[PDB]
Amino acid sequence: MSTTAYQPIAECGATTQSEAAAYQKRWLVANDAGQWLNRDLCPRLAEVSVELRMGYLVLKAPGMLRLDIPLDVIEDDDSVRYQMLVGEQTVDVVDEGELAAAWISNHAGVPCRILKVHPDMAEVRWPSLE
Secondary structure: OOOOOEEEEOOOEEEOOHHHHHOOOOEEEEEOOOOEEOOOOOHHHHOOEEEEOOOEEEEEOOOOOEEEEEOOOOOOOOOOEEEEEEOOEEEEEEEOOHHHHHHHHHHOOOOEEEEEEOOOOOOOOOOOOO
C-alpha cells in the first residue's frame, strides 16, 4: 500500500484521510518567543491525532480532548492575522484561536498556539540558523 499519509498540519503530522489532501497548508504551532515550534524542537507535538471534516479540522490528543478549528471556511475580517517573528522574519500568520492555544499549551506544555500561515506571505522557511 502507498503511504497515503497526508500532512495538512505540521506538528500534528500524518492524516490517513484523503480529505486532507485538499486542505493541507503550512500549518504549525508557534511559541511565546514569536518563533515557530517544530517536532525537532518539541517531539511531543508529533503525537497528535488528526481528523478532517467538511469545514472543520478536528484535532484529538492522547490526553487532551478534541479541538475543531475552521479549516479555511472563514472569508471575513475576523480572520486573526497575527504578526509573527520567525527569527527576524516578520510574517502574517492566522491565529486558530485561544482554544487552540490552550489546547496545545496543555499537550505541548509550553505557552504556544497553533497558527495557520496565510498563502499571501506563503513562504517563511524557518531560520536556517543563519
